[PDB]
């Protein structure tokens, strides 16, 4: 019938000295199937389920490089939100991201998600039309104007309508 | 496969 794929990401800046920690966990049909942790010995995506082992080294290498880039993005944009909310550095703060797709019984997309929360509070979320944004406060409206100029919604919609669905069907064939 | 956030706050 219907199936779903979801990623939850967290980035928390550390105590005074170190750099933040970034975790990424993916779910297929509400089962955790991959995980990445920047505090690990050597950070890399790892299989959380035996039927993800049938992927070659190129797969884990590539998504791991994506994760490296995402870590950098989280450092940069936590600094930006420090700026927007006028908070002192050297504190502790959290950025949380959730995105993914719900596809139905016909195999195509019923709903896409892309949304961001800061320190436990909603920051900006992609509406169900996948073309407009809900911004919870003023700083979020700054970001929203930027993302309207930059065509962010089209970028995310390209992911959610295309590779999200196809990668999910792919992971389901792995079962 | 993950999606890079890309766009800046």
């Amino acid at each position, epitope marked *: 019938g219907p199936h779903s794929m979801r990623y939850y990401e967290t980035a928390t800046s550390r105590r005074g000295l170190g750099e933040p920690r970034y975790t990424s966990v993916g779910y297929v049909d509400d089962k955790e199937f991959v995980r990445f942790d920047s505090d690990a010995e050597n950070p890399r995506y790892e299989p959380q389920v035996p039927w993800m082992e049938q992927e070659g080294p190129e797969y884990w290498e590539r998504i791991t*490089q*994506i994760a490296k*880039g995402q870590e*950098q*993005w989280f450092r940069v944009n936590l600094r*930006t939100l420090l700026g927007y909310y006028n908070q002192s550095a050297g504190g502790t703060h959290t950025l949380q991201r959730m995105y993914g797709c719900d596809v139905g019984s016909d195999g195509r997309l019923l709903r896409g998600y892309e949304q961001f929360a800061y320190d436990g509070c909603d920051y900006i979320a992609l509406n169900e039309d996948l073309r407009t944004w809900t911004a919870a406060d003023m700083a979020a409206q700054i970001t929203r104007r930027k993302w309207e100029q930059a065509g962010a919604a*089209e970028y995310y919609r390209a992911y959610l309508e295309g590779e999200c669905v196809e990668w999910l069907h792919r992971y389901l064939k792995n079962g | 496969s993950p999606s*890079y956030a*890309y766009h*800046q706050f």
Partner: T-cell receptor
Amino acid sequence: AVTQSPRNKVTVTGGNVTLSCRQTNSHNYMYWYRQDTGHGLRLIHYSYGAGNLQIGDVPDGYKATRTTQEDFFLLLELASPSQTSLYFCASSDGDYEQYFGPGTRLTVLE
Amino acid sequence: AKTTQPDSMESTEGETVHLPCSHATISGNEYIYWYRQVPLQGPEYVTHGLQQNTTNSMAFLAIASDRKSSTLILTHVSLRDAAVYHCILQGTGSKLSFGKGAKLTVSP
């Protein structure tokens, strides 16, 4: 705006050379490139914010310092003839479009 | 992820110039960006795109349906359009050299 200083520089090999870049775009990323015929535009060092430094593609013989969000410096503590080149700094908001400075032409003579 | 262009191209003023770019390993996390560098200057942004063709006052950008190739289209080039045009991928935080690009000459 991205400004560079000096615009031209001639020095003997083994000397100390500092290139200065300033950026009033409120951008986080800044970059130092060199321009040479036959190679195009190659990246030396970059930075995503004050205090951050990341190695580029051709970093040997260069250090860099990001003292503030506006200021980025390229240091050649032991300048050598192969570092004769045309140097461009640039700024960027994340992975959006880069804005380049006017260029510094450097000749290093033996 | 890297791009490939023919390093030079000759043209005559009044022609419409098609600058090709090959990027077969592109991913969904990367945009196609095009820059222009006139002699004695640093590059400047020309255009960029994700999937759909893109148009502005400086150029038209045609993206292959599979995104594995690109074409920067300059309408009725004049002498001031002679420059090095850089086609690069941006995204994933990867900060790389621009490379050599394509040297466009415009003859009268």
